[PDB]
Subunit: 205 residues, 5 copies
């Protein structure tokens, strides 16, 4: 099957509005932030302006194709795919997507989406000018799907936290840790899941 046929099939049958739930599994969404830049920081207002790649991964079996004499992967506009409705709860501006809105789809149905996002957050900026640094916590989860529908997990972070970080930022990254929680809010009786990203950073000497 060629690239054109795969993308035709996906465009014609994909249901961007349908969570690709399988029987009674939640859709396992993995989330991992790779920080590229820290552009503006305010210790007084506890506000931070930040650029990061939001590595998002999940499975959608309906996109799958037989890769016998066919490409293993294609790039697909996200408007033709179901995409998890992730939001950053402590964000104070809408995500400015810097990169083309294309996801990578593998023949088995895996979807890799990695937009570069600039976004401002309300978090702990105290101690940014210290050796210990500030620890800014960014919380990301599904806005409308609870835990029986979307689970979110971090990945494993044994590649350099500064691997893609800008050497020319005023700031440097001491540490990045990722944990998950199941929270129960007063609007709704079900538990919603999130990945908490801890950005320990500081102003350069």
């Amino acid at each position: 099957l060629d690239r054109a046929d795969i993308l035709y099939n996906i465009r014609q049958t994909s249901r961007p509005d349908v969570i690709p739930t399988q029987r009674d599994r939640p859709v396992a969404v993995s989330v991992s932030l790779k920080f590229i830049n820290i552009l503006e920081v305010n210790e007084i207002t506890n506000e931070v302006d930040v650029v990061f790649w939001q590595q998002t991964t999940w499975s959608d079996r309906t996109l799958a194709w037989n890769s016998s004499h066919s490409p293993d992967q294609v790039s697909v506009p996200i408007s033709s795919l179901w995409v998890p409705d992730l939001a950053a709860y402590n964000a104070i501006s809408k995500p400015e997507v810097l990169t083309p809105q294309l996801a990578r789809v593998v023949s088995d149905g895996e979807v890799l989406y990695m937009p570069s996002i600039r976004q401002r957050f309300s978090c702990d900026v105290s101690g940014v000018d210290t050796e210990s640094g500030a620890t800014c916590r960014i919380k990301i989860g599904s806005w409308t799907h609870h835990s029986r529908e979307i689970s979110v997990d971090p990945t494993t972070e044994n590649s350099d936290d500064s691997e893609y970080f800008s050497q020319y930022s005023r700031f440097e990254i001491l540490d990045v840790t990722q944990k998950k929680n199941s929270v129960t809010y007063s609007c709704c009786p079900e538990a919603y899941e999130d990945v908490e990203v801890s950005l320990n950073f500081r102003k350069k000497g």
Copy 2:
């Protein structure tokens, strides 16, 4: 009836331009603001910049499905649903919607849309640096549907008004009260309902 079928049926037959009035009866729309952040304040200009979740709830029986062996709920893009034309009257900027534009639809036809919104308002900022604090009143109602078509239910869950307010804001919340008004404006003959949200807050100190 699986998720895909329900969302197909809703997309195909939902009449998003059509207020889901039942008989002579107004659509009962409940509104409740949960404040997340207070980002900028100006006592001189009486302007406030604020992030809140606008918890909006109503009934549309045309969305309903038999939930016998089916999901109790689905998430649906708001473009495929009728949504109340709520507006904040004392808003001085258009609502910046920070979250995915998806509503939660229950099998009996109840709809929860809970966007996170950043928006600026013109309101009483006097006494923001006092113990008593400022009391900033935000008025929300239907822009074109009068009281025989849309009623607003101003009920508040009695939890911390700071359940999800940012501990890192320069400001803190003393109190949040909600009341309902019914107002005859000179433009038109009929009364329009609103919810008045009183945000009593102050600078930390």
Copy 3:
């Protein structure tokens, strides 16, 4: 008919690109600005930043329905209606529409569209800090339809000037007067009609 049928018929047959000229006569469009706020003023640059409701009224007989056993009125997305191409001539920013883009349509074909608009203007700000106040003149008319196609007249000097004006603005309204001009510019061969809105205001003391 019911609300759904009326809205279907309007959506299916309304011709948004078509001025609802009746016989050989101009469409009589009435325009009236109700000022809500004055947010920023600069006496040096003669610039003003202002929030107002643009009460716009006109007739479109093609939208009419028999209201015998039917609703007198419905709310309709403006994208499904012809709307006069009004522009504020001395505007220096595009109109930021703050409210839902719905117009109210009466069974006889009468339309009311009354968006809340934030917009900046170039006008006389001199004397803003005086007792006499500044007098800022805003001109509004059709951008492409001349007087044999669109007439604009003001509405009703009844409603108080400060009727909806924010008590929390730094400024107060002394007087609002509205007047129809008819003008033959040198570019074009026909008369264009406008409404001139004179906002006499000042800084509070």
Copy 4:
């Protein structure tokens, strides 16, 4: 034909992607800027912020209709028409179109599109505070069509320079001249044409 029929026909058959070339002849596009305002000036950065009407005129014979017992002219959304791909070469912001995006089409096929545009430019601001004034040159031409396809031309100019200029601007207009260039650049060995608009202006006493 009535107005509705003419606009239906245009909408149904207009080919917005298709330059209305006749023969091997270029489409004669005339361009003329009428300055309304000069809002911000910086002599240090050589940047200017300006509001002007960009009067654009051209012929599209495919739009023509028999005007025997029919209107001479209609207003048409520019999305239903081919429009020349004009760009200001020395622009440093995208054109902010302030007015409704409607062109005027005459029964013989002439199309008059006069949007009001706010846009910033990089040009010579030196001597703005002098008697002689600054002379800011704005260059406008087709971005992708060369001279055998689009010929850009300056219109007639009995028209007064400050005919429509704001009396309330900090600045005044001494002179506005328009001339035509035909540059063959180093990449591409086909000629590209522009209209150069020279805005001689200064700060008021």
Copy 5:
């Protein structure tokens, strides 16, 4: 064939979603930045604000037509073509496209798309006020297509750098060099090609 026919065929059959891969070989995309302006510079934050023409060239054989008695070239909206998903890696704002979104298509299938872009970057601004100048490096490559699907090379180095640059900028260009890189990052198993553009510039003085 005439212009209308060519554009119809392209619109009807172009597969904008489909990389025009020929055999298992990569689409050879050439990229070359021509700097028009440098608008704002910050040596403290290492941020730059820049206007450039992003000359992008590539082949799509599916767009080809027989040019025997037909035009050699047409202009085509990019929404009707596949376009490489290029992104500037060190950008900190989304590309503000200043120009009309049209690409030039040649009868053999060559495509030249050359938008003018304003964009901000994070790069080395140190020494901007020196004789040596600052050297700001901008990296551009495909965001989702690796090196077996997209190659990127600079266009050939006979052309010029200052030829299009604004004489009125506060800054001047000393040198522009373009080199190509192929780089495997730890996030992803495949190599991604980029073009690195080195902008050596300085403040006039």
